[model samples]
Target chain A: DKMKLQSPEFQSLFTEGLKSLTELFVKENHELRIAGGAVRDLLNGVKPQDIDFATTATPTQMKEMFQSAGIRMINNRGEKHGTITARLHEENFEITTLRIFTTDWQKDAERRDLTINSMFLGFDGTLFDYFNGYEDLKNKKVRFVGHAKQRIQEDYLRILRYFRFYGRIVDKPGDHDPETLEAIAENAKGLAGISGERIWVELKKILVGNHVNHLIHLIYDLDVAPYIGLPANASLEEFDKVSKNVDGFSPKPVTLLASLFKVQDDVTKLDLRLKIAKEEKNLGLFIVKNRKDLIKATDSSDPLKPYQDFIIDSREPDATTRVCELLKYQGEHCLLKEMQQWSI
Target chain B: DKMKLQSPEFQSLFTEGLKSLTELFVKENHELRIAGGAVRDLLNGVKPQDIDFATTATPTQMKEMFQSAGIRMINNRGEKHGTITARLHEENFEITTLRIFTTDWQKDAERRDLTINSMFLGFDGTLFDYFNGYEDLKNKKVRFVGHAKQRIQEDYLRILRYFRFYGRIVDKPGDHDPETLEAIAENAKGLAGISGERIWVELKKILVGNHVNHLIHLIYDLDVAPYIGLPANASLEEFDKVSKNVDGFSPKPVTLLASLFKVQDDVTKLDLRLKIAKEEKNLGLFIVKNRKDLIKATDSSDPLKPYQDFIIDSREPDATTRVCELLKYQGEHCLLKEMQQWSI
Candidate 1:
C-alpha cells in the first residue's frame, strides 16, 4: 500500500530551509524524498531528530545544480558515496544519490539492512514503501530488506545493526527468525574484519536498549561474541541477573558490559578490541573490581554507609560516578539514590 | 529544600480560569496553592492531566466568597470533606480547604499517605514542601508521610496506593523499608473492609506499571493478597514468567492477573471479591482456560497456525481480542503481531 500521511509532524518538516530545498529539487526536476529512518519515524508519529534525503540526481548533477543556485556546499567526505551537502537558509542538507543508475527504487531498497529502514517519503507525504517496509515497521518486525545472509554480507557491521534495531523496534526478545539466526551464526566470523569503533557504536546501543539480556545471549549463542570483543566464556548467569537489576535504571553501556566480564583481563581484552573511551574502560574496571566488595553493609542500620564511605575515601575524580553505576549493577536502587545526592 | 520552580510547564498552569480564581482568593485574602499529585507531576516536568487546589479558606467561607463574586458552583457532594467545586471561565476547579483549623502546613502534610504526595505549590512558583516531600520525590523514594502503621490505619486503601505509587516512581523493585512492610503485614486484615471497586482501581494500576512482579510478590509476602481478592496460594512461578511475557506489550490487567489463578474458581473468587467488570472477568476466565491448551504448534513449520485456526473457527465476538491477550501471556510476540493483523 502506497499510503499518504499528512500528520502535523509531517507538515512541520517544511521549515524555511526544507521548503527552499524541496522547491529547488522540484524546479530542477530531480526526484527527492525523505529517506529511510525518517520515513519510519514519521509513520510512528515521532518527529525525527535527524533526516536524510535520497534523490535521483547524481552527486555531480547535485553539485552543478547547487553551484548554479549559489548554494554553499561543505563536508565532501561523503562525496565518495554519492552524497552531496548543500547549505540553504542556514541549514545543512546531506542528500545522497539513490544507490541507482539501475535507477529502480526497489533495487536501492534491497541494499539496506532492515526492511524498517528501507522506505522513503516524498515532499507531498506520499510513502514509497518498496519491499513492504511500512508493513514490517507497523508490525514492529525487523527483517532484512531481502535475503538475510546477503544483507549481512554487504556489511559485516549489519550483524550488530540487526541486533541494535531489534532492540529499538521489537516488543519482546527471542522472536528472531530461524533463518536469520542461522545466517548470523554462519557469518559470525565476518565481524572480525569490521572496525572496532563501528562495532562498539552498535554494541553500545544494544547494551542500553530494550531486551538487552536476550540480545546479548543471542550474540553469544550465534558465535558472534568472541569476534566482537566479548569473552568466549562470558558470565552469562551474572549478565542475566545484572540485566534485571539495571532494568529501568538507565545504567551506562560499560556498566552493563562489565557483567559479561569475569575478570580485569576481560575488560582489558574488551578495550583492545573495542577501543572504548578511557572513562568507559575505567568504569568497566571499577565495577568488575568492586561490585562484590563495595556493597551495602548487611548488618548496619544505614545500608548506604559503605558506598558513601568508599566514595569519601577514594582519590579518583569519577569514583562517585562509577560507584553510582555499581549500585545499578547490584540493584541497590535506594543506595544509588542516596549516592547521587552525596558529594564528598 | 523549598525550591522555587519557574518551569514553562509550571507557568502554563496560569489559565484564564485559574488566574481569575487566584485573583478572587487573593482579593478575599485566602491562601491557595496547587496541591498533592499535581504538584508532584509539575516538579517532575510533566503537565498534570488533573489539578487539585488546596486552600486555607473553609468550605463555608469558600461558598460565601464564590457566591459574593457571582461564580457558579456545582457538585456539593465533596463539600463534606471541605471541598468546593467552582466553575470559572468554562473550567471547573476543585478546591479543597486544607484539613486545618489546626492551620499549620506541616500538620496538613502529615495527614497525607506518602511523602511524595504531600507537597503544595504557590501561585508565584514558590514550593511549600513540609516534611521534605521534595527531597523524597527528587530521590525517587516512596515512603509514608509519617509512621506507616498510623497512615495505613487511617485508610486501609493507602496500602495498595503505596504499591501503585511505588510502581510509578521507584527505579528498582524490592527497595522497601522493612518497617513499612511490617506495617503493611500488620494492617493486611484492614483491607477486607475496603470496597472491591476501590481495591480493583489500585490493583489494576499496580498490575500494569513498572516492577509489577516485585510489587505483586510483596502483596503476597506482606499477607495483603488474600484480603484484596488475590488467592492466598498464588501460582507465583507462572506470575513471574507471564509478567516478563507481558512486559512492554501492555497486556490488559486481567491477562496478567490470570497467571496467578490456579483454576477457573480463582477467577470466580476474584470476581466475587473485587467486583471486576464482566469483560475483565471473562478475559481472566478465557486466559485461565486456554493459556495451557491454545499454544503454538510445536512440530509444525507454521507455529502460528494453531492460534490462527482457533480465531477463524471461534464463535465468540471478542475471540480475536482474547487470543491476542493469550499470545501476550504466552510471550508469542511474533504470533501476537501476526494475530493483530489477522481478521475473519
Candidate 2:
C-alpha cells in the first residue's frame, strides 16, 4: 500500500498535502497515511481532490499551530470523534484520530455500514482489515460489515448507509455473503431514527453516482423500503424504472436522484426529520411526482422534440435533465448523446 | 366552528376566497365537505392556507370544469389515489377523491402516517374521519388509525411518523394515550422498512410546526431512538441538553436534533434509508454539523448563560426574529430582552 502511494500522482498529492500540513506546525502523533475517499478513489483510478489524515492531534494544539503559521483551518474535529479540517486554497483536508467505539465490533462495522468503507490505511500504508473490508472492496462487493441485526442495534439508521455504499462504490450485485445479506434483510426494519434529510442526501449520492440500478433491488431485498415512507422503494420493479439510463443524467446528486425516484407531493413534510433544504426538496419532489409528464414529453411523437418542453419552463435544469435521461433510457439516444443541448 | 372564521381579517379572507372559488368552479361531491388541516386549523383558531376538498370527483373531471371556468388546475393524482389542484393567482387549492383503503389500513395510513393527518373534511363542514382522527385531534394526541402494532406492521415507517406527529400536533407528552406511546415503544423496530426520506419529510413538517418540545422526550420515553440511529438521542443526559435549549440560532430541525443526539456523522449516512431528495440530506448535515458554533460562539464562559452576544451577529429582520426565537428557551429572558434593543 505504501508502494502504491508512491504512484506518481498519489505520491505528489499525498506528500504535498502532508508537507503543507506539517509546515503548519500541527501537533500530532504525526503518524499518518492517506485516508477515506481519496485513498479509495486514488486506488480506483478515480482522480480525487485531497488526502485526509488520521492522527492524535487535539484541536486546540492544531488550531494554535495553524494560527502561528497563518494556515486556515476549520475545526470539524471534536465535532464528532477526533476529526478536524484545514483548507489550502480550494482543497480541504480532514484529520481524524482512531478511537475505540462504545458499540461492539459489529456496531462499529454497522456504524460504518459498508464493507469497503471499513478499510483503513495506516501510517506505514499497511491496510487494516479488522472487518474483512479489504476482501470485500477487492471483490467489488457492497455488503454490510457485520451482523446486520447487531449492527442496526449499534446504529439503526445505517440501513440507508448500506444502500448508498452499494449504489456508489460497488459495481456488482448478489455477490454478498448470505449471512450478511440476511442480516441486512432482517435489520432493515430498525432504521426508524434515521431522519428524512439524511436519507435524501445519501440516495442523491447514489443517483449521481449513476448506480441506481444496483440499489433498486437491494432496497426491496432488505425489506427496508417502508421506513423511507416509500415501502415500494424496496420493490425491484419501481427501482428498475428509476434505474434505467441513470448514467445519462447530470452530476448534481440530489437533482439526479429526484429524477430517478420521481418524488412528488409536498416534500416539505420531509423537512421535519431530515435537514433537507426547501429548494432541494421542492426540486426532488418535482421530478418524482411529475415523472409521467416529463416522460410523456420526452416521448413526444413529434419529429423534433423540443427540449424546452421538458421542465415547467426554462428555470428548471434538473427537470429537463430528468426528462432527457428518461427519454435516453427509453432509447432516445439523441437526448443523452448531447450533454448540453439546451441552455446550460 | 363558523364563529372561529368570523374574525374581521378571517372573515374577509375566507368569504372572499370561498366566493372566488365558487365563482371559478363548482365542486361536485354529492358528499362534499371541508377536510383535513384546513378544517382542523379553522376550528383550532389557526389560519389554514391550503384547503383540501374531498370529493368523489376524479382529477380529470374536476380539472376540466375548472378549466372551463377559466381557472387553471393541477392534477396531483397518481396511479392509486387522486388529488386535484387549482391555482388562483398564487394560492394553490388541492381536492382529492375520497377512497377506501384496498391495501391494509396500515399501508393506507402509511401513506397518511399520523392519526391527526387522517381526518377528511366534507363540503358541508362535516369532518369525515374514517380513523376516529377527530377524537385523537381533540384529545391532543397523535396515534395511528388502527391497531398500533398492526399499523406499524403495515407501514413500519409509522414509528417515526407517530413521533413526528407527537412533536408537531400533540399539546404535550403527558396528553398522549399510554396505549399509543406503549405501542410505539413496542413497534419502533418496524421503522427499519421505512425509508429515511419519508421519515425526514415528516420530521421536517414537525420541526417547522410551532409546537416541537414534547417530541424530544416522547421519543425517548417510547424507546424508539435506537432504531433510527439515535442511541444518543434517547440518552437522558443528551435529552436534558436538548430540553434546556431556547436559542434563536435555532437553525434547521435536523441540525438542532443532531446536536442533541450528537449524530452528525450518522446524519450524513442514515438518510440513505429514507430515500429522500439529495438537497435535503446535504442541508440537514450542513446545519447540524455547523450549528454548535452558531450558538455558544467560539469562546463563551458559561453554557448556562443565554447566547446574548450571539444574537447581534444577525441583524436583518427575519434573521433577528429567527435568532430570538431559537435562543428564547436556551437561557433567560436576556436573549429576548437584548434582542428588543436591536434596531434591526
Candidate 3:
C-alpha cells in the first residue's frame, strides 16, 4: 500500500528552486520525484540534510533539457552513472536518471541496498514504497531490498553500509535477521576488493555510532573484520573494556578501533590495509605502545599525573590529543575530561 | 621556598593591555602582580580563563592612577571591596587592593580560601608562595590557606568551594584530610546563613565533577546536605546508581541531583533554597514523575522507543532534551546518543 505524508517538514522541501526544477521535469514530459534517504528522512519528520531525486528521463535528455532551459549543470563526471547536477536558483539539485528503461519505480527501488533507503516520494505527497521501506523505517528495521546475497554482491561496500545503517536505525543490538548475517558472511570476502578509503569511511561511521560494542562483535562474528582492514586476531577482551569505557564519551574512531590491536604490528598491518591517516596510525601505535605501562599512578594522590606529565614532556604537537585518546582507551572518564582541558 | 614558572602559557598572558596596565601600576609606585586562581593555573601550565591581580595600592590610589592616566573604569560598585576595573587596549583588568596594609604577601595569601588559590605571580615570573600554594598545587593537594576552620569561617560558602576545588584538584576520593573534614563539619552549619544561589552554584559544579559518589557521601558524613537544600532522607542508593550511570556522559547537574530526591516536593524545596531555573525545576519534576514508570521498553526490539515516542507525542519543545537527561539518569548511554539525534 502507498502512503501519503504532507507534514511541514515535507512541505518545506519544496523551495523555489525545487518547485521550478519539478516544473521543468514535468514540462519536458519526464517524471521526477524525491527518492531514497531524503524520502526516508521526511517520513521521519526530519529535514533531510541531502535531498536526491530520481527521474524517468535519460541523462542525454536531461542534459538537453537543461541546456534548452538555460539552466546550469556541474559535476559532469557522474553522467555515466545516470546522475546529473542542475543548478536552479543557486541551489544544486542532484537528479539521477532511472537505471531501468520501462519506467518501473519498483524495479529501480529494488536495486537499492536497504529497505529503509529504497522508497520514492511523488511531488504530490505520494510515497511509492515498493519494498515496504516506509514500514521498515517506522519499525526501525534495516533489511535489504530483496535477497541479501544478491544485493550485497552488487557492491561489496554494502556490507559495511549494512552494519553502519544498522547502528543508525535498529533499536537494540543483536536484533539482526539471521539470513542477513549469513549473506554478509558469505560475501564478506567480496569487501577485500573494495577500496580502503571506502571501507574506512563506513567503518569509521560504524565505530562512532550506537551499539558499537555489539556491532564490532558482529563484524568479527560474521567474519567481516578480516576483509575490512581489521586484524585477524583482535583483542576482543580489550575492545569490550574500552568500548564500555568510551561509551557516552564520544571517543575518536581510532581510539575505539585501537583497542582491537594487540601489538604495534597489528596497527601497522591495519595501516597497510586501510591506508589510514598518519595521525590516526600514530594514535593506534601510541595506544598499543603505552596502554600497558603508561598507566595511572597507584600511590600518588594525582592519578592523572602520569598522563599529564607525558604530555608536558613530549614534543609532539598532538601529544595532548593522543593522550586524551589513551585515557579513553583506559576508561579513565574523569581523567579524560581533565586531560582534555589540560594544556602545557 | 618560592618557585619560578616561565612557561609559554604564562608568557602568553602578557597582552598589550596587561603590559600597559602593569606599567601604569609600576610607574605610579604601586607594586602589582598576578594573584589567586590565575597564578595557580599558570603554575599548572594552563592559561587562566580569568585573571585577577593584587596590588599594594588601595582602591582610592587605583582610582586616582586610572583617572590620571586617562583610562576608562567601568563597574564602580566593586571599589568598596578594594577592587578596581581598568580598561586598556579594550581589555578589562580587575585589580584588587591587598586586604592587609603591611604589604606582606604571606599575610594577604593567608587571607584567601584554599592554598592552591592563594599564591601570587610577580611580573618577573617569581611565584610568591607565602602559604606553599605552589607546592600544594604541584602535589594536587587542596587545603585551606592555614587552618581549615579559620578560612571557612571567613565565608561559609567556602565549604562548597572546598568540595568544588577538591573535584578539580584531588585525584582520588576519600583522600581528604581529617582536620579538613573536622573543620568542615564544625562550620557546615555556617553555610545555612549563606545565599542559596551561591551554594547552588558550587553544588552544581560538584555534581558534574569526578569522584562525586565519594564527595556526596562525604557531604552526608559531614552533615553538609541538610543546610544546603538537600533532603534529609536522601536516596543514597538511587544517587549511587545515577551517578555511575551519568559518568563520562556529562549529565545535567539536576539530572544527577534528582536521584537524591524522593518526591516532587523535594525539588520544590530545593528550588526554594537554590532558586534554580524554571527549566531545571521542571526537569527535576519530570524525572521524579517518570523515572519509575516511564522507562525503556522491556520486550521491544527498540529499547529507546518509549523515550522517542514520548518526545514525538509530547508538545513540549524541550521534551526531547528532558528525555535525553532522563536517559542519562538511567545510564542508558546508547539510547541517550540515539535520542539526541532523533527528531519528531
Candidate 4:
C-alpha cells in the first residue's frame, strides 16, 4: 500500500545515494525513482538486498554522476541494455536511464513478466503502480504485466520465470492463469533454444519451493516439460505422496532431481542438457539406480548394515538422509520411524 | 628434460592456437610464448586449465592481433595492467604483454614467487628456463624465484600464497625454505592490512588440500594464524588426529574449521574476519559446540540414546556421518565396526 524501508541504516544510505544522483541529474531535468524488486520487497516488509534505480538520464550521464559523487561504478555488464551498476559497501545497485520507457512508464512496466514485480517507488515514498502491481501484490498472485503471449514471445525465459516467481511469492495454488499457461505451452519450443544454464537456474529455484509439486504438475500438465528436458512418462505419484513427508529438510538440486527420475538415462539426459555439476550428475545417476534397494533395506532386520554398505557404494556423505527420502518414496514411513526409534 | 606434451589432442590445439596467434603478430616481431603456470604445468605433465601468453606486443597490439584473428577479446580488467584476455569455449586465456619482463625475460621470471612457476615454453617446443625452474619442478621445491623478503614486501598476500602453493604442489615437504619462513615471520604484521575475503580465498584452498595439517602447522609455526583471526591457541591436534580418519570423503570448509576450534566465540571471530557464508559459519559454530558430546556419546554404554540426543541438538543433515567423524577422532574405529555388527 505504501513505500516503506525498515532498516534505518539502509534508509540513510539509500536517501544519501538518491540525493547525490538526483542533484547530479535534476540539473538536466532528469527524473529518478527506485525500480523493480526493491519496491516490491519494501512494500512486503522484507529488506531488499539490492535496490535498483531508473532515471531519464542516459548511462554516460549516470556514470558521470556516480564519478562526480566519487562512487565507483561498473558499466561492463547491463549498461548497453540500459542498466549501469554501482557498488556500495560490497553490494550492487543498478541505475538505468529508462531506455525502454521511451513510450511511457507503463510500456516499460508492461515489458516485465509479473505484475507484482513491475511497480516503482519514489524517493519521497511515492508509490507508482502502472500495471495494477499493487493489487497483484495484495492478492499474492503472479500475473503478467500485460499480454502474457506477446510478452513471453519476446523472451521465452519468462515462461520459467513465471513459475519461479510463483514458487517464491505465491502460496495458494491450484492452477496458473489459463491464458499464461496456453501462451507458455504454445511457445515452449523457444525454451529448447535458450541456453541450458539459464533454464537450469530457474528450474532449481522452482524445485526448492514449498509448492514445488504444484508447479511441476503445472509444468507437466501444460506439456512444457520436454523443452527443459524433464523425462516424458516419469511417474510423480510417489513424488506427490512424499512431497511433504520430511519437514525442515532442504533438498539439494541433485536430491530433488533424483526423486523425479526413475532411470539413469533420464538423469543422463537432464545432465547433458543442463550440464549439471559432475558430483550432482553422478549422484543423481547413482540414486536412481540404488534408491529401491536403499528403501527396501529400511525394512530389513539389519538396516544399519545395508545403510553402511550403500553409503560406501554411493560414496554419499549424507546417505542417511537419502535413505529416509527413499523410504518416504516407497511409503515405508513406519520403517523409517522404527529406524529412528531404534537409534534412540 | 626434453619438452613434452602427453595428450595429442591438447598438443594439436595448443600448436594450432599458437600458429594463429604467431602468424597474426609475427609481422611486427611481437614475440609470444606460453608463460607462467601453464609452462610449469606442462613440464610437470599436468594439463593446464588456462594457458597464459607473455608477449612483446602491447595490450593494444595484443587486442588487435586477437581481433584480426577473429577471437573475441576483453581488456576491461587487465588492459590497464598491460594484460588482455580472450574467450574460447567459455574459458578465458590471458594474453598479457610483458611489463616486468621489459629488460629481459629473466627479469620477469625473477619477479615471480615460486621457481617452478618462473619458466616459459616457446611455441616451437623450446623450454626457456631462467631461475632453475625445471630443476625445482623435479625436486618438488617451492623456493621463491627471487629473494623471499623482497617478494613478501611486494605483497603480504604472497605469504598465504607461499603456503597455498605448497599445499597443492609440494608432496614430500618437511618444511618450507627457512628464509621464506623467516621473511613471512618478519612481515606477519603486514597481514592485518590485507582484506579478509582475499585471506579467506587462500585459507580455504589450504584447508582442503591433501597435506592440510602440514600446511596448518607451517601457518602456526610462523605465527601467522592470529593475523587471519584464527585463535592463537587453536588446536590442530584434534585436526591432525581426525585429518585422515575418513577416506573418500571431501572435506567442507566449515567441518574442518569446526575440528580446530573450541567455542562459539572463535567461530564468530572467524565469521567476522573472513565473512564466511552464513550457513557455513552457523554450522561450524554448532559442530564445535556439540562435537565433543557427539564424540562422548559414541563411546557411551548406551550409545544409541546419547547419539540420538546429540543428533537432535546438532540438527546436522548428515548426523550419521558426523557420528563416524567423532568416532574417527576418538580413534574408536572398532566401536563403529562393532555398532555396525550389532545392528546386523
DockQ leader: 3
Tens digits of per-residue lDDT, candidate 2, B1-344, equal 34123443234444535556655445443334456566666556676666666555555577677777777765533665577777766566776665553321222333565667766553344454666666777777666656576556577766666665565565544666778777877777777556666666766665555445566566566765666545455446643454345333344555355555454666655565555455445544544535444564212222222344444553433444444444442332332443545562
TM-score of 1: 0.49
Q: After aligning candidate 3 to the native by TM-score, how far in Å is the CA of B184 from where it should be?
A: 1.8
Query: TM-scores for all candidates?
Result: 0.49, 0.42, 0.50, 0.44
Per-residue lDDT over B229-261 for candidate 4, one digit per residue giving the tens place of the 0 to 100 score:
687667688777656553224556666767778
- TM-score (0 to 1) of chain B, per candidate? 0.90, 0.67, 0.91, 0.78
Candidate 1 residue pairs in backbone clash: none
For residue B236, give model 1's deviation from the true position in Å. 29
DockQ scores for all predicted structures: 0.01, 0.01, 0.02, 0.01
Off by over 4 Å in 4: A1-30, A68-70, A75-80, A101-106, A246-248, A291-305, A308-344, B1-344
TM-score ranking from best candidate downward? 3, 1, 4, 2
| Model 2 chain B poorest ten-residue lDDT run | B297-306
Model 3 misplacement above 4 A:
A1-344, B1-3, B75-80, B100-106, B290-292, B295-298, B301-303
Worst 10 residues of 3 chain B by lDDT: B293-302
Q: What is the TM-score of chain B in candidate 1?
A: 0.90
Which of the numbered candidates is closest to the native, going by highest TM-score?
3
lDDT of 1 at A29: 94
Local distance difference test values of all predictions, in order = 0.82, 0.54, 0.80, 0.68
Question: Which ten contiguous residues of candidate 2 chain A have the minimum total lDDT?
Answer: A296-305
